[PDB]
Enzyme design. Sequence first.
Site, PDB file in Angstrom:
ATOM      1  CB  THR A 122      -0.929   0.040   1.220  1.00 53.48           C
ATOM      2  OG1 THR A 122      -0.135  -0.289   2.360  1.00 53.48           O
ATOM      3  CG2 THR A 122      -2.106  -0.906   1.115  1.00 53.48           C
ATOM      4  CB  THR A 123       0.265   4.540  -1.751  1.00 55.24           C
ATOM      5  OG1 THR A 123       0.380   3.796  -2.963  1.00 55.24           O
ATOM      6  CG2 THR A 123       1.012   5.852  -1.868  1.00 55.24           C
TER       7      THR A 123
END
Lengths: 97, 250, 197, 238, 238, 232, 233, 175, 123
Positions: free
Chosen positions: C39-40
């Site tokens: 994830t960002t």
Amino acid sequence: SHPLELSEKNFQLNQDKMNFSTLRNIQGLFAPLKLQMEFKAVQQVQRLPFLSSSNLSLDVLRGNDETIGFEDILNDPSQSEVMGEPHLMVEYKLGLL
Amino acid sequence: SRRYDSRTTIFSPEGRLYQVEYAMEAIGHAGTCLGILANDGVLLAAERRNIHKLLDEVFFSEKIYKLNEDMACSVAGITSDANVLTNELRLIAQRYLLQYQEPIPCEQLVTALCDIKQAYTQFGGKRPFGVSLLYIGWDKHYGFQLYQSDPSGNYGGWKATCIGNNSAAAVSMLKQDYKEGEMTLKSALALAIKVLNKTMDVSKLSAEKVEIATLTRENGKTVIRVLKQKEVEQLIKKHEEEEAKAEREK
Amino acid sequence: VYAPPVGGFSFDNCRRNAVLEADFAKRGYKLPKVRKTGTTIAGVVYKDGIVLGADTSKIHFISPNIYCCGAGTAADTDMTTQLISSNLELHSLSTGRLPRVVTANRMLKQMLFRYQGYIGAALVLGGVDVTGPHLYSIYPHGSTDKLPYVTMGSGSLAAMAVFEDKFRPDMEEEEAKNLVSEAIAAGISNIDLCVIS
Amino acid sequence: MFRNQYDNDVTVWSPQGRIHQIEYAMEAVKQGSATVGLKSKTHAVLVALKRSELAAHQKKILHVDNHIGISIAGLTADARLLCNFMRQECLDSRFVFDRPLPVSRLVSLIGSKTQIPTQRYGRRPYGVGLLIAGYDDMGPHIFQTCPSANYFDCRAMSIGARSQSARTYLERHMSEFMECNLNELVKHGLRALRETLPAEQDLTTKNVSIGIVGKDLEFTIYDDDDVSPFLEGLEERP
Amino acid sequence: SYDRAITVFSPDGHLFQVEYAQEAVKKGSTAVGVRGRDIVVLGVEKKSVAKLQDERTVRKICALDDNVCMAFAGLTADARIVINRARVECQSHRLTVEDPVTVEYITRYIASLKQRYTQSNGRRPFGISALIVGFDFDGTPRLYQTDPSGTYHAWKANAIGRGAKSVREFLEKNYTDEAIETDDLTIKLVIKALLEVVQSGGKNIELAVMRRDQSLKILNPEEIEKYVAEIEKEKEEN
Amino acid sequence: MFLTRSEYDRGVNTFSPEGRLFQVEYAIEAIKLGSTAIGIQTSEGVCLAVEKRITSPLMEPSSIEKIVEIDAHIGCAMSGLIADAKTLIDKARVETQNHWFTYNETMTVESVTQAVSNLALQFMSRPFGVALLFGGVDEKGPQLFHMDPSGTFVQCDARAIGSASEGAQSSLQEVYHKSMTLKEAIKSSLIILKQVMEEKLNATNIELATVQPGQNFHMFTKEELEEVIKDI
Amino acid sequence: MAERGYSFSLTTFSPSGKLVQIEYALAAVAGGAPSVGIKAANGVVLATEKKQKSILYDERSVHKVEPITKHIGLVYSGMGPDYRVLVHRARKLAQQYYLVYQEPIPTAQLVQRVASVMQEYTQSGGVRPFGVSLLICGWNEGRPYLFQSDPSGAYFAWKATAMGKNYVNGKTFLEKRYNEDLELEDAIHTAILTLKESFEGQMTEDNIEVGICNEAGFRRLTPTEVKDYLAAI
Amino acid sequence: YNGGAVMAMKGKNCVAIAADRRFQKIFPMGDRLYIGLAGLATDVQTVAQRLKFRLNLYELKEGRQIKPYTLMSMVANLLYEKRFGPYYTEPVIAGLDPKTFKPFICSLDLIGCPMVTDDFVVSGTCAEQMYGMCESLWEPNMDPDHLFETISQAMLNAGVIVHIIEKDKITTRTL
Amino acid sequence: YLIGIQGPDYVLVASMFKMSEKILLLCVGEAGDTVQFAEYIQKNVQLYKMRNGYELSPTAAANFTRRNLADCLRSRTPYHVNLLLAGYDEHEGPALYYMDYLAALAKAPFASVRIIDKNGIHD
């Protein structure tokens, strides 16, 4: 096996050791001595080895009462899946083995 | 004695540990649990000692804790002791069912907690676990069994026995009116009510002041089955019907 | 031994587990594989609160006020935030007061330090405690910095470039969460704005 | 009579304000036999009055390291423990620093070793006094230890049984000793040992060990008929 | 006085607490041993019935190895641990040595375990005694006795627990090479020695028959009763 | 002006007013409760003999109690308590095994008794209720020793311990001379054990085990005993 | 007879088979601060008497009624030090259970675990039992629950009970009062009135404390709520 | 090495844990509750037996039957125990709830990460392949009759065993 | 090279060190570990027999030897045997529990001429 094996094996050893070092250096020789004498007394009060024991006095003297770790919540030793002979377990604690 | 009666490490001139004999006395003052090994199963009839009107039951059984599929036990003596001992009985059985994938044969499990309780005499600074437990069992070796264990670790096997209050009295009533080989679980449940009713003086065994658990075998599966209020009401009213029929006969 | 066994991580498969590794690798064979966040994640500070950005969400719970994004392993981000949650609940229960983001941060750092980033928890730890809107950059190896904003994981660089370009010292709430959303948008996957006041 | 309650532990005080089980350890010195220890400017002599002829050879004088040894008056389990401890101290001083261990310092090490028991439950005072005679750069040494954790520096002393007789001799000739030879200082020690003995008894190269260290001399335990040559020169109980 | 601690001596020179664990043995159920011609037998009384009690769960003759078995006659739970642990140590030996394990070996283990429980007063010595018979690698018949004190001792005919002396004294006479030659006669002998011990015959008796070739294999009460009637027919002949 | 019941004699740690640990001397009375063991060190070896005090003709006299071997040259003769003997036999035997597995030398008799007084002197929570009698012919030469409750050892030429410790050590005082042969020691130990023993010395109610510089520690057989105790 | 040897040591049984240090730790309970547990239709009430009734006391400091997890709390009569360390533990074990089974610990389960601490502390020698008993209530499985753990570590489900002082009198009044169907709007009043039986003074938000479980979970009643219940009764 | 991966689908108070045969994948736990352990067969066996020990004890203590979610929690716990030196498995706890009989399916990796899906999941070494096939064949509301076909098909497309777990009586379909 | 042929009661097997009266174990692989482990487990089932009054079923003995080989592998990084437990149970009937290098199990009809039967063992 793994690096962390021994870092975790002796985690508590190589913390309370560091606590006693700090107290020696700041408060004095007396401060480790006092804490040590309390701990040893309250861990001369548990069940025989072979029953899983709840050592409320030692835990609250460390400040563990209000703190959980992986130690607690993994590899449940209270539902241990591997126990020995009651008598032979007690002999091991006595140092007859 | 006034000495040799302290540490449960200290023998007498006779060779007696009075500590351990006082743990037997603490069984003396407990719920009557009357077990009767049968043909069809093996039952675990009882006195449901604590029956106060404000007291609640949010459990499956009162004194009767089950061990694995194939075994259950009862409790007469020190209640806190018994709680940790009956948790330990389950855990013993499960370790054998983890290593050998078999539901623990009955003698093994009894003996395992007897070794625990024999340590709790051997080692002074510990208290002799003041509980006796009556183990209804099935295993592949010895069909159905009833057992006992003691605070000492001294354990036995039985065709009918009792623990708790009026226990020797109850065993006397069994020795009168038990017929090894003829005794179906039907006639054993009849004898169980009879002997409870004869040994303790509780109205007409009030059905909430007794409890039975029948460890039977149905379609090659072991069925540990508490008798309903309804069903001990049926056993006791039928016992009393026979009592009244026999009162007319005499 | 005839010694009572204790709890924690067990290091017994280890060498035999590494024999599996060696064999399978050599022949050209697969062994089950670690599942990740990839994830960002994002965080910001504004006048009187925090926002935590993520993409699909990485934002986990610590305390009523404290939340904590997860980049790294998914197992381990979730595990550490849940255990640290329970720890700060115990702390709060006795204290009598909602627990602090300094408490969350110290604990996370110290725990991840003990296990020396063999557990993948690269977290953006954002709460608004009594002492006000705090944001940290908890790392798997038990390091951290107390930053106004920080991004980690999958396009962190693009997200951080947006942040540092389009940040103002004391924001409004809506422009603060706007920033974390456009930063996530740069790294990427639904924007995940866990706003805190 | 009231001391009853407080005499049977080493870690209880009395109303009177004294630990009686340390004083009883200091009576257990006297259950062992009379060792003499006296020094000059060249040598530090010990002598020991050995209480069958076949059985119980009784090794009163013991050698610790080159520069140092002791003689024993009281509990012999404790005598052994203390001597063996000193051997290790001196071994380690000659392993790390590659020198002898000061006698003063080594008697201080024994002092603190013998204090732990008295201020600890499940323990009792080492029930023995030593006469700890070494030679350093300093010069010769005698160092009385007591069953109590306290200890002395001496130029002469006797400890053990009816040993006041020896102590008295060693005061009368205290001055002689400082400026005596090896063998002169020894005969002085033996005449203290003989003052302890009944007049009907004598030294008769039998109940004599002699444990002498000095300047080039190392601690050497003359026993049996290696004490004969020292007792050649000694004459006239009168 | 010195019977209020396991680990104290007396002026007369006794551990009375250890002798009180031997009084707990003495309050036993008569267990009898013989060590005959390529045979060993352990007759031991059943003592009590209790109509409605399974006998499997309560037996006085337990088997330790292929070529070792015993007959305990003191406390029951104490003995259960001793016997469990004798099998533990039997298996340890068997595995490591690669030997069908000696009788003497495990009598020494049982002894040393009871010695390990004699040397604390925060423990108690197992108040039980076992007649550990059997055979060796080569096949030499054995009989022993183990004690709460924790000594092993070698025997030919034995008789312990309840009415120990009575039944030992029977064997002092009736144990002979012409009552030994055959396995019949040694079975008869322990039965007839238990026909001194306890009134009933073939009724309250539980009798182990291990041979050079064979193992414990507990007898039936019909098998023992045959031999009770054989010695009864010998009594009819005399 | 009143009589008090003060006890220093229940505790091995507790000193009398005179400074006596009574429990050690009560364990000396337990050595005296055990069986007489006579050893005689000579110029030509050291012998150990000891009475078995066999009581019944049902107990097996063929079995060997009261005497042990520890290596090649050294064994000891136990007397007091066999249960307590065992743990000090094991010390001696393992630590001289270790000496042969370290230095490839068999440990000197003085050093074996040092090792044994390290396992003793450690009160096991009671003053060891055994006296051993360590008779070996080491590197240095023949050597008898004696161990006691207190835990320590002491060197011997002629020692009797056990039942008639001083009954039989006074016989040794008259009988033993410095220039004893090992044959002499054997016969003298035995004949004095005979005149101590309330029973008559045959080979079944005695253990003898003897070592010379040449012939390492062995256990004198039925026939060897029989021969000497026919002469003596 | 005196039989005082047996009544000092907690590891001994008595000639007749009594454990008497347990009984004397239950005597410490039976000289406690009156508590009343009434498991009602719509949740439980733990209405209790405060050991302070003072002009000098900080209201925000001390609580007789403490939560363990959201849905559980408990109240005590006997020992405050002992109570406080036992509930530090209770909270730990609830959170351990929620890291293992991820299920808010059942009231029964928690009760077992805190009563297994009690079990150890009567078992072992060189400790005392805890001189405190615990009315551990809480809401699970669309059901109210109340229990009563002891110094000994024996625990039992209750519809209605009392502990501390005039507490047998408590349970007598409460046997006469409590209905099976009595719902929690009326059980708080009943528990206030069971306290009135076992009270010494005038009863106010200060001199008692109340705390209740529900569908929602466990809380303590605000001084306002407690005095409003006292005004309504 | 025959790793494999095992599907399980959401249905009409039914789930179809569909698991490859060519070692034991399907392990019953509760009334209508199973786990699909696939990966290294030896670690699968070990960790399934250890789970069953922990499970049986929980069950004895509680009084109730384990919820698939609580079972999944224990699975993750016993896998995270081996964070360092893992059990080579990927369990999927695919059952109906003992009380609700609500379809519930959730894969794990070899160090836990439990993850619950409301259509289907696949867990193991081959998981990718028959996941694709299942999606192509999948339908919202799956009566157990036609359910079977969708889940055998996909598994075999990537002779498998489809335990069609049921409210009324569990079906099994070895092929 | 171990051979496994389980039958109606007829468990013919070849290599080969037996557990009980009516059980064989086959052990091959790491010459040493092989017969070490066979002897070890053949003496653990013996301990169980001498204690309980009944020996381990083929099934119980197979479960047991898998738990014992599992912890062998964990500890010693070869600790390599390949194993059959050609068994017969008094309660059930015949067995043939093939077992891997990393301690698996499989009752495996296709896994001397030692027939493992109710009557015992019949090389």
